[PDB]
């Protein structure tokens, strides 16, 4: 069966109004796995909660670990994993933790104990990114030794073995500099291919967050910066297709056009104006794009890259929608990859709150649940 993971972020609960996302916004069958972003690390490489509100506490009660893991009562196939790292975490602490067998063992033993204590079924490593010969060998050793310790703990306790996964780079230069893929593949249950953030407001070149295929609207040098090329690259380097889980974004990326009359992919811009709820210039959520379309933005379809974009005055947004998710699910099924994962639950229209919503919960993620899982996610309202 297809693997359909979804990232939960434990800070989305702090967004305002309609954007507040809590574990109780989940709906059964939407995902096969929830990856909890994030678990955290002490200076000595032992594991700690990122947020004090992850743990049982006086000001908010059960804690987000228990509230995510309680989802398994009403979604009996669901598994959960605790993810370590992410972009904001940087690399400094990973580089120190991975430096020796001794320092790796401190983290590994602590993380295994920690996920068993808090009810998670796996450990996900999101180091962004190992780079260079030392990191490359140390990352192989970390994943190898983590899997070995998980097999030992499973054999010793008789419990089902913890999963070992990683969110991994999609860019060829980053892949080649940091990942020895033939010596990682045997030790991962699967990898979460971060096949997004290809273009974004860190540069002036306007392009697509997650194009499925290249387009000749962008310079030839970019023709490998797309979901297809990245998924094939990991397979060619030795990762079995069934372990490649294709990354699906529910956010988008946007520019303020330097020239409001030049609106084609490949134009130029600075970062988009900040959006109300995501509060990060150049980033926006699907439930914000749906309102832009209701407020006069024009939707275009890029037939080469099979993704949409919208234009509102001098604002130009690359995003994903039901149609791009459909092209991409067809691709996953046609090419035989292991499934598709979502970053994030909280950027989809998770509560059908868009002013133009017909009531469908998770309009984007429900495409994955349907097309890879055969699962129909309900509409909001009375049943």
- Closest to ligand NAG by CB, 152 or 259: 259
- The CB-side HSE value for 226 (13 A sphere, CA atoms) comes to 22
Is 251 known to sit in a ligand binding site? no
Rounded CA separation 85/238 (Å): 24
A 10 A CB-CB count for 195 gives 30
Output the CA–CA distances (angstroms, integers) from residue 168 to 81, 85, 87, 221, 239, in the order listed. Answer: 16, 11, 11, 22, 12
Distance CA 63, CA 49 (A): 11
**263 or 326, CB closer to ligand NAG?**
263
Kindly state the smallest distance separating residue 268's Cβ from ligand NAG, in Å: 9
* 102 sits in which H/E element: helix 101-118
Contacting ligand NAG (CB under 6 A), which of 77, 259, 279, 355?
259
Q: Which stretch binds ligand NAG (CB under 6 A): 75-83, 199-207, 258-266, 294-302?
A: 258-266
Nearest-approach distance from CB 266 to ligand NAG, in angstroms:
11
Stretch that binds ligand NAG, among 83-91, 123-131, 254-262, 341-349 (CB under 6 A): 254-262
CB 329 within 8 A of CB 247: no
Q: Which of 24, 62, 128, 291 is catalytic?
A: 128
To ligand NAG, the closest distance from the beta carbon of 347 in angstroms equals 31
261 binds ligand NAG (CB under 6 A): yes
Q: CA-CA distance, 130 to 93, in Å (whole number)?
A: 11
63 is in an annotated binding site: no
Q: Tell me: is residue 59 an annotated ligand-binding position.
A: yes
Residue 58 marked in a binding site: yes
Identify whether 153 is a catalytic site residue: no
> How many other C-beta atoms can be found within 10 angstroms of the C-beta atom of residue 119?
14
CA distance 169 to 172: 8
Quick check: 204 binds ligand NAG (CB under 6 A)?
A: no
The phi-psi region of residue 279 (left if phi > 0; otherwise alpha if psi is between -120 and 50; otherwise beta) is: left
Q: Does residue 262 belong to the site contacting ligand NAG (CB under 6 A)? A: yes
Tokens for 66? 């228990």
User: Which stretch in 33-41, 147-155, 224-232, 256-264 sits in contact with ligand NAG by CB under 6 A?
Assistant: 256-264
Minimum distance, C-beta of residue 267 to ligand NAG, in the bound complex (Å): 8
Q: Annotated binding residue at 88?
A: yes
Catalytically annotated residues: 128
Residues found near ligand NAG in the complex (CB under 6 A):
259, 261-262
Residues making up the binding site for chitin: 58-59, 85-88, 129, 194-197, 343
């Amino acid at each position: 069966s297809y693997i359909r993971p979804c990232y939960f972020t434990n800070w989305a609960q702090y967004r305002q109004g309609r954007a507040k996302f809590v574990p109780e916004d989940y709906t059964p069958g939407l995902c096969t796995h929830i990856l909890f972003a994030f678990g955290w690390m002490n200076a000595d490489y032992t594991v700690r909660a990122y947020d004090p509100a992850d743990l049982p506490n006086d000001w908010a009660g059960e804690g987000m670990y228990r509230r995510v893991n309680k989802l398994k009562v009403t979604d009996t196939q669901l598994k959960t994993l605790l993810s370590f790292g992410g972009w904001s975490f940087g690399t400094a602490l990973f580089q120190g933790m991975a430096a020796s067998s001794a320092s790796r063992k401190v983290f590994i033993d602590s993380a295994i104990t920690f996920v068993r204590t808090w009810g998670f079924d796996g450990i996900d490593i999101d180091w962004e990114y190992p780079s260079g010969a030392t990191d490359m060998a140390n990352y192989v050793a970390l994943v190898k030794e983590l899997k070995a310790a998980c097999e030992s703990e499973a054999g010793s306790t008789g419990k089902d073995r913890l999963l070992v996964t990683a969110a991994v780079a999609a860019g060829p230069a980053t892949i080649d500099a940091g990942y020895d893929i033939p010596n990682l593949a045997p030790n991962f249950d699967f990898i979460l291919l971060m096949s997004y953030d290809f273009f974004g407001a860190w540069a002036s070149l306007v392009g697509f967050n997650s194009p499925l295929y290249a387009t000749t609207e962008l310079p030839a040098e970019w023709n490998g910066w797309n979901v297809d090329s990245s998924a094939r690259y990991w397979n060619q380097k030795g990762m079995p297709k069934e372990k490649i889980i294709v990354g699906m974004p529910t956010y988008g990326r946007g520019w303020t056009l330097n020239n409001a009359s030049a609106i084609n992919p490949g134009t130029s811009g600075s970062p988009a104006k900040i959006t109300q709820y995501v509060q990060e210039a150049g980033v926006g959520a699907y439930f914000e794009f749906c309102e832009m379309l209701a407020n006069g933005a024009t939707r275009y379809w890029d037939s080469q890259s099979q993704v949409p974009y919208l234009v509102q005055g001098n604002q130009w947004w690359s995003y994903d929608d039901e149609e791009s998710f459909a092209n991409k699910m067809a691709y996953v099924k046609r090419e035989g990859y292991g499934g598709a994962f979502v970053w994030t639950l909280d950027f989809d229209d998770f509560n059908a709150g868009c002013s133009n919503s017909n009531g469908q919960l998770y309009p984007l993620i429900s495409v994955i649940a349907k097309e890879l899982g055969g699962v129909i996610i309900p509409k909001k309202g009375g049943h």
